[PDB]
Design brief:
4 copies of one chain form a homotetramer. Chain A is of the alpha+beta class and about 250 residues long. In chain A, the strands form 2 sheets. In chain A, strands 1, 2, 3, 4, 5, 6, 9, 11 and 12 form a 9-stranded antiparallel β-sheet that branches. In chain A, a hairpin with a 5-residue loop joins strand 2 and strand 3. In chain A, helix 1 runs parallel beside helix 6. Chains in contact: A-B, A-C, B-D, C-D. At the C-D interface, helix 7 and strand 8 of C face helix 7 and strand 8 of D. The structure holds lysine (4 copies) and chloride ion (2 copies). The site of one chloride ion has 2 residues of chain B, from loops. Chain A: InterPro entries: BesD/HalB-like. Chain A: It comes from Actinoplanes teichomyceticus. Chain A: This is ArpA protein. The PDB classes it as biosynthetic protein.
Chain lengths: ~250, ~250, ~250, ~250
């Protein structure tokens, strides 16, 4: 388990090459683990993708709303709640793995602490229809490891768009204005990829799907020392009737 | 008339040195904005143009709702007024060929602006009204467009110009989303009364979709460079909604 | 009485919202400038600081003309005043530990600013006077520097700050010129009286060499972040305190 | 010789297509710069060897040391040796290749406009040859639009000698604003290896070579061409320091 990942990473990374990833993580708020920079063995990834497949078919929940705390940006997708995913022993132990968190802490350059609100530890988003999107937003917590389990071709949409070095003002998000002042980075993803995101200071969204395509991710959210008290009444993934949500 | 008036308006607000700085920005971004800090036409001239356009819209508005295969099937959801209709405006047509207007902007393009383009693309009015209306990602067939931001929604409703300079249009392989993955997007917010010069052939651009029923109106004056003086694609959707490259939605 | 007046000076100019915007710029560029549009200290306070430094310069300036091996043999061609001389100044030393100043700037760093650094690096004055004087490409050992641009030449004479944020310092392989080949350089012009906050550990930086015999004078207040505590100093490259440090080479 | 164009046309046809040249044209407009390295050779290795050997003989015979400041570019230094255009034109190979219809035709696909080999006779060709610590080609623009630069010999990147570039700028000789432009714009640094070639948009790209940090050799050949916008142009500035060390704009 841990011993297999410790050996797997030891053959694919050096302190020097991980320091280069830390540069790119702080510069873009984003670092991708693809065929050239794998993070988990293919067996470990298949097991997690299989467990997520059983969880989607069993507990998927449609969402279609505008979130007021992010300028009424849309959330049009299906979700599997954190409390359901936590029952997967595989996903639960892996998210708290001392080998995994220790390795990525060399990229964040600060302690990764698996202590977040129990409704936000894990989240699966499953998009299926044209115009499905995870609109522009920030996270309440500092870190997220995103598993790009199933990604459509880039021509169908689903790319991550990001503006790093921003912050979330839930009473004045200024999202389109911040786009007008800042260059947007678009990150294309392939199935099997993973990426680490600095969610609290990186404004981000997924580009809306142009046709009916399948886009599935797993979100493992972690805290830094900086993450306190939650606010906004905007927990739309856990509560579709949240005060900040406006149904569509 | 307007030429002698425009020449004096520009001479009080620009030097060759400051035009050269605009030429820097126009080559760097494919875009230079004529806002309240850098006016291009007197307020009376724009009011005349906008009034002519609002009549052309009220009379000749033609709704467009399609996908364009030559630009990766990006949408065109708007109303248009065709060039032949707009060319009936003596004002818009005369202004678009003004040797004072073109001579000034040629200090920004650093090359001759030639008012010799196809008779169906000399002028275009687009007019977005409903949620999700957009002028999707595309290039122009010609080098230059002077865009009149006659009416702009508030930025929180969308309608911003997004642009990626230093690209080109391959109609058999546009690679729009792949180009976005490789390049940074510049977003240009626009207020009513703004104009901007756009390098349309090498700047991939779109307008951000309307997040709510809002009004977004522009006039497009398209010009050629010496490099533009044979068309292809079968994709002239604004003049012909039944173009071979237009798909239905 | 410094902290009481400084807190008023800052409360007139800054809000949590405006500081958050500065924190965004500080994270993005490794650098936020406190110029005429964003003053940090009252003019009478900076004047007092600058006169302390000119006295220290007149009494304790030492010429440095060397290359540093831990930063790719980049030059240090300047005069300096050592930290232990500057710490004798009651004004500078107490200001550098001001809970009001450090508390304010911590809203830009978004983390605690800790005035616990090596006694040979709490303060540094660099004083360049001659053509080709430069503070060559380098990083700092600590996270933070507040730089007082006490005297700046005209921009056409050089002396600008050049910076590449989001980098790191490997003293055995600093890769200075290779990093410049892979990254864009931000040049920051400074005027006399400016101050700026610098993320010194992850921002590769230098001062553009003087093209004329002009005078360029700064005060460097260096502080630690939590990450810097307990960590060990390596490199044998403390050239400002020891001109014949092991990593220093003749120029 | 004589059969150089027939072979060069084949060499390019093996490596380049209109689609792939169109990608290079996008980079050239964006950066003012496109590099021909091992992944994208421009000329056969035998042909570059002949050009380098020609340049080595021209250097040993006709080099001239320069150490000055140029006022039309803000007193930035020129600290190097040079070989002037009239001496380089005596090489039948270099002079023929610089007007090659195959070479110019190919590069015109990257410039997206005609490349015209009609420039001032003192500026058709230039070899710069740096040898000593602090040697540099200081920040400047060119009077003409295009230059193909042959990086015949380049030191290790740790020793300096990289190209730095700020594209989408302009040269005002009475007020060049070198350091002000650097404050407003990001600097692109382009490292080079011996054997590389690159195309540069010299009239709108502010550029220099990073000063050598120690005694190393850095040797380039500069083939300068015009665009239509440079034709019948009045040369101004009195700053042609490579031809005339006593040029009015030059300062010792
Ligand atoms: N706050 C985010 C949701 C976080 C999902 C769980 N980490 C948003 O506005 O969409
Ligand atoms: N080529 C443009 C149309 C421009 C018409 C006016 N210049 C498009 O596909 O949207
Ligand atoms: N590390 C710096 C010296 C900083 C001393 C004051 N913080 C250098 O090598 O130049
Ligand atoms: N204008 C350049 C010289 C270019 C000569 C060769 N094309 C300079 O000032 O250094
Ligand atoms: Cl258009
Ligand atoms: Cl040159």
């Amino acid at each position: 388990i841990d011993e297999n990942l410790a050996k797997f990473l030891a053959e694919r990374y050096t302190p020097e090459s991980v320091a280069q990833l830390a540069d790119r993580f702080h510069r873009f708020g984003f670092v991708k683990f693809d065929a050239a920079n794998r993070l988990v063995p293919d067996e470990l990834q298949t097991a997690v993708r299989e467990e997520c497949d059983l969880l989607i078919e069993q507990h998927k929940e449609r969402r279609n709303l505008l979130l007021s705390t992010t300028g009424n940006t849309p959330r049009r997708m299906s979700v599997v709640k954190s409390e359901e995913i936590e029952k997967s022993e595989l996903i639960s132990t892996l998210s708290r793995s001392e080998v995994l968190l220790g390795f990525l802490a060399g990229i964040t350059r600060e302690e990764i602490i698996p202590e977040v609100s129990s409704d936000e530890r894990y989240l699966i988003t499953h998009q299926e229809f044209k115009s499905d999107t995870h609109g522009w937003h920030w996270g309440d917590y500092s870190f997220a490891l995103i598993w790009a389990l199933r990604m459509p071709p880039i021509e169908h949409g689903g790319m991550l768009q990001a503006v790093p070095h921003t912050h979330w003002d839930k009473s004045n998000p200024r999202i389109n204005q911040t786009l007008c002042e800042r260059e947007i980075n678009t990150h294309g993803l392939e199935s099997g990829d993973l990426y680490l995101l600095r969610t609290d200071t990186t404004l981000h969204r997924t580009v809306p799907l142009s046709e009916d395509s399948t886009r599935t991710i797993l979100n493992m959210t972690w805290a830094a020392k900086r993450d306190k008290d939650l606010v906004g009444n905007d927990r739309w993934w856990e509560n579709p009737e949240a005060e900040a949500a406006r149904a569509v």
